[PDB]
Design a protein around this motif. Sequence first.
Motif, PDB file in Angstrom:
ATOM      1  N   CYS A 120      51.931  49.096  40.571  1.00  0.00           N
ATOM      2  CA  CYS A 120      51.451  48.043  41.513  1.00  0.00           C
ATOM      3  C   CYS A 120      52.447  46.881  41.641  1.00  0.00           C
ATOM      4  CB  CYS A 120      50.083  47.508  41.102  1.00  0.00           C
ATOM      5  SG  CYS A 120      50.168  46.008  40.088  1.00  0.00           S
TER       6      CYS A 120
ATOM      7  N   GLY B   3      52.482  43.961  41.003  1.00  0.00           N
ATOM      8  CA  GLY B   3      51.729  42.880  41.669  1.00  0.00           C
ATOM      9  C   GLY B   3      51.423  43.227  43.115  1.00  0.00           C
ATOM     10  N   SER B   4      50.532  44.202  43.334  1.00  0.00           N
ATOM     11  CA  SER B   4      49.988  44.585  44.664  1.00  0.00           C
ATOM     12  C   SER B   4      48.806  43.670  45.020  1.00  0.00           C
ATOM     13  CB  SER B   4      49.590  46.040  44.679  1.00  0.00           C
ATOM     14  OG  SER B   4      48.361  46.238  43.994  1.00  0.00           O
TER      15      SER B   4
ATOM     16  N   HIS C  20      43.548  46.221  34.856  1.00  0.00           N
ATOM     17  CA  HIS C  20      44.469  46.077  36.018  1.00  0.00           C
ATOM     18  C   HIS C  20      43.734  46.518  37.291  1.00  0.00           C
ATOM     19  CE1 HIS C  20      49.119  46.054  36.876  1.00  0.00           C
ATOM     20  NE2 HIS C  20      48.436  45.229  37.680  1.00  0.00           N
TER      21      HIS C  20
ATOM     22  N   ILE D  24      42.675  44.155  40.396  1.00  0.00           N
ATOM     23  CA  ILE D  24      43.316  44.343  41.738  1.00  0.00           C
ATOM     24  C   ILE D  24      42.209  44.555  42.777  1.00  0.00           C
ATOM     25  CG2 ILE D  24      45.062  45.514  43.122  1.00  0.00           C
ATOM     26  CD1 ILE D  24      46.112  46.743  40.437  1.00  0.00           C
TER      27      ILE D  24
ATOM     28  N   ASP E 117      44.655  40.056  41.596  1.00  0.00           N
ATOM     29  CA  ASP E 117      46.012  40.544  41.228  1.00  0.00           C
ATOM     30  C   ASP E 117      47.061  39.531  41.706  1.00  0.00           C
ATOM     31  OD1 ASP E 117      47.925  42.212  40.109  1.00  0.00           O
ATOM     32  OD2 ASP E 117      48.016  43.553  41.851  1.00  0.00           O
TER      33      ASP E 117
ATOM     34  N   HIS F  95      49.501  39.525  36.304  1.00  0.00           N
ATOM     35  CA  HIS F  95      50.913  39.730  35.870  1.00  0.00           C
ATOM     36  C   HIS F  95      51.455  38.465  35.195  1.00  0.00           C
ATOM     37  CE1 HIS F  95      51.543  43.733  37.655  1.00  0.00           C
ATOM     38  NE2 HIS F  95      50.630  43.310  38.537  1.00  0.00           N
TER      39      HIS F  95
HETATM   40 ZN   LIG Z   1      48.317  44.822  40.068  1.00  0.00          ZN
END
Ligand SMILES: [Zn+2]
Length: 2031
Positions: free
Chosen positions: A1844, A1846-1847, A1949, A1953, A1958, A1962
């Motif tokens: 991800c 950081g998606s 996580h 998200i 999200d 992180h």
């Molecule tokens: Zn993420």
Amino acid sequence: GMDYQEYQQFLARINTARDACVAKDIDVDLLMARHDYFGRELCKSLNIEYRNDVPFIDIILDIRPEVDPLTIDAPHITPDNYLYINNVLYIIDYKVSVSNESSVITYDKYYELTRDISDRLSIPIEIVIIRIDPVSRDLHINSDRFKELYPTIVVDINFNQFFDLKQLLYEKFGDDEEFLLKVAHGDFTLTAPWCKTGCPEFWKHPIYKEFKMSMPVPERRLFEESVKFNAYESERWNTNLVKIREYTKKDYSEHISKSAKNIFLASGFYKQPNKNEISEGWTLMVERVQDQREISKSLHDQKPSIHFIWGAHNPGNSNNATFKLILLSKSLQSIKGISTYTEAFKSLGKMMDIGDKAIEYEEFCMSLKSKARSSWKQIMNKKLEPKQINNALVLWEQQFMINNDLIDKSEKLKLFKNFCGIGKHSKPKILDFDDANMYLASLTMMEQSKKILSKSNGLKPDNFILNEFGSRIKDANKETYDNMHKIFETGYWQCISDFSTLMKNILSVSQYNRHNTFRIAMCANNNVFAIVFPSAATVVYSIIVLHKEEENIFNPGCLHGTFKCMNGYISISRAIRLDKERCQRIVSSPGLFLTTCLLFKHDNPTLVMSDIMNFSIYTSLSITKSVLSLTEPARYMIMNSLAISSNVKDYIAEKFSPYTKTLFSVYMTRLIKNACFDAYDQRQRVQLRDIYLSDYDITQKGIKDNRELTSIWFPGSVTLKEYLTQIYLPFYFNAKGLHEKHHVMVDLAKTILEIECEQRENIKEIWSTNCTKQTVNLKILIHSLCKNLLADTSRHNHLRNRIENRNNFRRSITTISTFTSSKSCLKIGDFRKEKELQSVKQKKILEVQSRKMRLANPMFNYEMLRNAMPNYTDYISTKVFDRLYELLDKKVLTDKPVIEQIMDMMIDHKKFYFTFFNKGQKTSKDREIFVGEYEAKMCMYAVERIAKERCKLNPDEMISEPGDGKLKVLEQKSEQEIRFLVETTRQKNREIDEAIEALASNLGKIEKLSLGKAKGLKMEINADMSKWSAQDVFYKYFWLIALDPILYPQEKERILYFMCNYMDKELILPDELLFNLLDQKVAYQNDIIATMTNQLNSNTVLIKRNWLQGNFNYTSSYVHSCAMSVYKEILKEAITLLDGSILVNSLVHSDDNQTSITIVQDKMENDKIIDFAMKEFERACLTFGCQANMKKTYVTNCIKEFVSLFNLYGEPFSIYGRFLLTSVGDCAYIGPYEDLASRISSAQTAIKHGCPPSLAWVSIAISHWMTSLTYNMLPGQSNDPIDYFPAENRKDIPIELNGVLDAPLSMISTVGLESGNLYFLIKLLSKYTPVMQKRESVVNQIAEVKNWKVEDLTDNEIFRLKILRYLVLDAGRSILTPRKFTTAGSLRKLYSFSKYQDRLSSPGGMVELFTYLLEKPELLVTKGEDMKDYMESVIFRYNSKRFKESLSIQNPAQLFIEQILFSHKPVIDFSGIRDKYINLGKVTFTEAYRLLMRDLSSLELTNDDIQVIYSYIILNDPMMITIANTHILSIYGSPQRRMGMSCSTMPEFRSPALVLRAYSKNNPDTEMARDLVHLKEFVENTNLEEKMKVRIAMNEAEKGQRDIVFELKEMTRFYQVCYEYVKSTEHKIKVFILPAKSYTTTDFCSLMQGNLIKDKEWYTVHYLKQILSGGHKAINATSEQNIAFECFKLITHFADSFIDSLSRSAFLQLIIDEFSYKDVKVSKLYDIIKNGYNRTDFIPLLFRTGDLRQADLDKYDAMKRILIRSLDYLNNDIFSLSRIKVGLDEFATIKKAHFSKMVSFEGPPIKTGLLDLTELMKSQDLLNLNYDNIRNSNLISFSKLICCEGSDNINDGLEFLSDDPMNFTEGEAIHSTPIFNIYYSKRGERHMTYRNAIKLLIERETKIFEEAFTFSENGFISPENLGCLEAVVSLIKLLKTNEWSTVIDKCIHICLIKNGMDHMYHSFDVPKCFMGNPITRDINWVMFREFINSLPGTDIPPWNVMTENFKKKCIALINSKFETQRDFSEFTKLM
RNA sequence: AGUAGUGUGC
Ligand SMILES: [Zn+2]
């Protein structure tokens, strides 16, 4: 295998077609379809371009186009393919056929024409025609130049799928004769006649008169007409056969209707088992038994259940021989009280006193043992004399003398007359099993046993089995390892094992037990002893035990009494008189016992392990005949009582007769009684598994395994499979040869004379219509013969030719085995002279042995028969090989064709004589064998063999199918019905089912229509015919010979004459029976034996209608088949009445029958047809003279009994157990390897019949145990070879020296014993090879061997290789083998052995033979092809002292004891061992180890010596090549449950005596000339031509003159090692039950491998490279290519299945460049595909990359009119890499591969918003092509597919998944009587995409994760909780990333998200609370530590344990960081 | 004594 598109169209064409001329073309088109299929796959196997029907004049233009084709004259032929390399044109014309007859025709045709331009262009053209067999699959190429080019060619071809279409086409049109006319290889070709003249006497014979008496007058003339008919004369063969068919067609047509119309007459009333019906039977049984036997209720008349009395061991007293001897001595002297034999037992202890002189016993005994241990032979002439010690006179170690002074004259008598029974000389004595106070007494005996035996040993649970095989058992199934412990711990094991070890020592002692001696036998138990009294072979013994307190002893009913002594208590058991045959089994009883328990308990936790063992000792040690009478009849009594249609009453009221003599029997009877009623109430407790059918076989078939049924022998619930085991297995506990021959001969004789009298008095009429006992419906017979005889000649024309060949009819009698064998044979004449002289010799030897007995312990006729019996026809026993020699020397047999001699013998021999000898097998009901004259054997040979090859044509007959081949046939026929049932149900109910789903509104109206529809009905008639031989009309068989088309008139006359004499045939009552009846002592009331012999006058009784048991199997079996063929026609006309469909399948095997009926109804109820089927079943039998036993016959809805091989609802299952109970006493006791060879073969057999590995290994352990127990080679024994040799454990000791078999079971199952050697070499190729070449083929790893270093190896590693080369390679390969001093014995009966005497006696004549044999060395190894050659071979054979012994039978019991006693004596001659080391007498086993090392240390190991091993073993055998490959290239995959078991055939890994005659002189007698060329290579490459000559040439200069002994013995060795190379082994039918169908070798290998790893899960297998290598000449190219195909097939489908349609090209482009499939770069594989000549397979792949040109499209279009831009336009809206439109509606094919291979991909990660597609490739669970399976999957599975970086918005990131619909599995009920659901694959709708599945998974699974990780009353919001989350996820990064933690992280996580959080996850580091100073990154572990403890935790599945383990792990780990064990001196330095 | 036995043996 084959293409699916063409299969569907060819299947539809079979139904569409009506006319035979349309069906003709479908057969013609199917040939070309197979023709091209073989060519398409072979072209890739050779790497060449594919071509079809290319002209030869164009083939030259490709090579040299400068000369035009008009001027240069080329042969106008049509080859298939061509190739030009090395200035030679190779022409290919491939064709698939069984024989090369069609290949040689095309060979010489091509070879002749190609020579017109071969000299014109001066370029030689070679003809290369490739043929493959359509069933056995063997490559045959004629071109010799082509053989050297291609060393190995890949041929995993499937014809199995082609023959399926053939079965359908020969089903509809096969009935019509118009279609059979079109299939012909000569229409009809009848070969040469076997006779020249007919038989006049046949028409005159009174039996032929008696035949026509009953027969009608129109039939009389028809029989005359049929015999005289010649098939070769009239235009067509079927002139007569059809003519007689059309006559009987009046009554037949009417009788077929008659029986069929009875479908309406029937009612729902059939013999169904019910509680009352069973109860009624039992009561009539009681009445019968209470009359037929003497019923007792007294508990003193009982016999022992077990013949042993165990009592607890005493650890306080010493465990040493000398001490125990005196202990028992004083103990026996100390017995205090008064009984009968009290003062006797007293004096016996007195006569074994030593006391003060204990040391004199230790010396004197050791001298005697040493005296015997010096000599090979026994110590003769020297007299053994005792030594007076205290009161005893010791004769040997634990042997004493009966002193007549120490015992009273009266007290000595008491012990022997009354107690021992030496000199003691009307219904059977039995216990009332219906007395509750007797059943009580029997139960209290069990309660007593459980009370004492359940108590632990207290001794270490570690014996050889566990010590050496425990490791290999535990890894298979941990449960069974524990189960084993549970046994060994418990007194049950110590009880039996000590009786085993004690009996071994009772027998060992009893051998040299004299008439004035009593011997003492002790065991591992220091309280348990045995006293072996003088035997008058018979073993007379008592068990004497010194138990702790009073009644701390186990009595099964064996004990005489307990007695109080001066120290403790001592108990002496009643004197048992058992025979060595019985005792042997008692010694091997522990092996029997362990297996029993483990097999019952296996994978059933509801069973009581202490109760299984409580029952097991009473079975495994039960040697009485009382038990067999229960175990056998139970099998039918239970199965009958749980079947649908079955007559229990009659079976229980007549066939069941308990012989409850012992007390266990009484308890066991009531166990059975009860089990009969439990069955009836469990009939409906059986369920039928959900059948997952989706075309070509089914996985998850068969019966449901539900533990709802109840056990039989112990308390608990059981599975059906286990229930059946508990039913049938009991019978295999039974013991062979318990039947006393004295009694058997009587009851066998009585029965034959009873049934012959029956016929003589009652049965007079032969034919009848009403159907009556011993009667045949003559009109119906003749028709049904005629109809079948037609179809069994139309389907094969060369039928007479096939009989001549396969049965050697043309060749001389001396070639056929059955005639040249060493079997028993009967000779008739007058031997009154020698029979009287041979008898009186023994009648003196009687007095000789009596005279010697009178001195020590004074305790104490053929002439008559001949004088008394007047009409005594004199006979004698001889050998089959001996009779042949006799008949040749007296010249009545000749080198004339065997059949031509048979024909003459049929008319020459006019009166036939037969004798019977008992088999006395494990069954309580004894079976006879009828063995008569050699003249007879010749007659029956022809008649039976002609019927053999006839029976083979019919698929209904199963005697034709050798071995366990039937098992798969049961399946294949069951599966056909399960399919048909479904198919037919869907074809009728489709109209009705439509309205049901339409209304389903009100559900009250639906039920009206759902009732009135079609109804399925399956049933299996598990039959068993009554008296197949005796109660059967023999007259019917006359017609089968008469009507026969492939028999000549002059033969027909002769066959029927012999059969006319086989009616006036006489049964000779053997003398042994007549001797019982000689000594009258008041005759029998109604003496049937005397009645038939006229108060015993003749020893012969004439047998008529009773054709003797087993003499006419095939003959009767064709008539059975003809009878069941009528039964089909009957039902098939009956079901057309009700208007539906029926499939009837009949399997025939003499007396055992199974007939499966499957009917789809419409009108009347199911239960009506059930009764109807059974009515016509008996009718069908009785219309042909056979009667069906309705007692034993049962009908089920699933189960199939046939020859005891069982098939459930598709799933085949045999009783794996029966073969595990063999590995205990099945060997000839020759040597350690020689014994194990057959004991492991029994284990190998279990695996075939679906046995678990865990239990398989148990047999392997037991086998080793017994093997090593025979020769004292166990750990701690005398000959224990671990200290004698350099090795860690017995795994490393060569199995030739006896150790253990260290190999995988997947190898042992395949090869066995040799596997153990093979594994020790594969271990090296996985240790001493570099990083490169190791991952490649085995062949490559063998090349590196000669680049090793010898110094690297270890003591043990060197040790193996030295023996493996210098001993193992050349010598069933053994080194240690004890030799015996056995005598030839009485061989007077033999004629042939007398001619050896006369040739040995007369001088010169001996050498004359050997000198003649040197000029014909073909007759040393194989018997002659001609008279002289065969005859003189028979005389030479007597040279061998082993062949002279071979013709005498030694008792395996006596043979066993003789290998124990002769183990410490010199037996192994080292002369034959040292000979090999060089190119004294006998040596003791101990010395044989020492003297092996003295020779072994001298030998030299090189880098060459090792390379001979890897040549002679691995590279020589193509099988060993593949087996090694399979275990190196092995990649074990997904573990799965064994849902669907299927049958599988073992694959292929590949002139005799006449060739060796063409080696003796290079000139042969054309194909046989070519066979010698490869034989020349074999003897030259090994160089054994010179090696043998040099060995002789230097021996004549060693010995002196001319030694004829060495001239031959060395020449024979040379011809015997030829035999194995020249004469090839027949690939016999071996069937293994595997978790799926094995089509080809590779498939078989994978499934076989995965079936023998774990018990709970089977594994699917993968391979890096191809495993099918062929040799060391063939070293990759063909192993690479297929990898590229697999790779891209996988990729294209993975891409178009899971990845989003929009972005699929990018994915592919990324994959191709930076990835690798199975360690090869995808680019290189793409280049391999692009550079290939089958690009047309990967059109859509090539188009998507831009590597597709017009040539490919033009080729593809020519395989099955196109432009590139056309494709460029057409495929603008089709986004898939597996599929592109190449027309208007024609898409491209990529050919889908399996998805279990995606793990073999290795490349950098491709990240798509959040998903990592690489991890989706590497994933196991989320690769299923089922919507529901992925929708209802776990978050732990998905949590691997996330990065991800950081998606945000998980919904968006999942855009890179296929939004195309997925396939779900739907199931429906079939509406049969056995109601089941079929499950199949559908295409779903639209909203069922891969995305929606993943989303729904995420939603459902995350909701559960959130509420489990709240840790507060808020949720996944509230920074107060997000802080806790941060804290919990922080430690996860600052600890140790194991596997549990990472999951939590990724799940959190996902969850964060999803919630749109999200944008912080992180940026989550250790909070301020934990971090003292932000800058100074310090961590407060104490705080963190107390934070973890301060986490509450939740107990919701599945995270309850997950979080729990996590916490504990993280805590423990954190605490670890602190706990640093520092050094004591470290700190003392710093400060 | 045991083993066999509605067939008389070991
Ligand atoms: Zn993420």
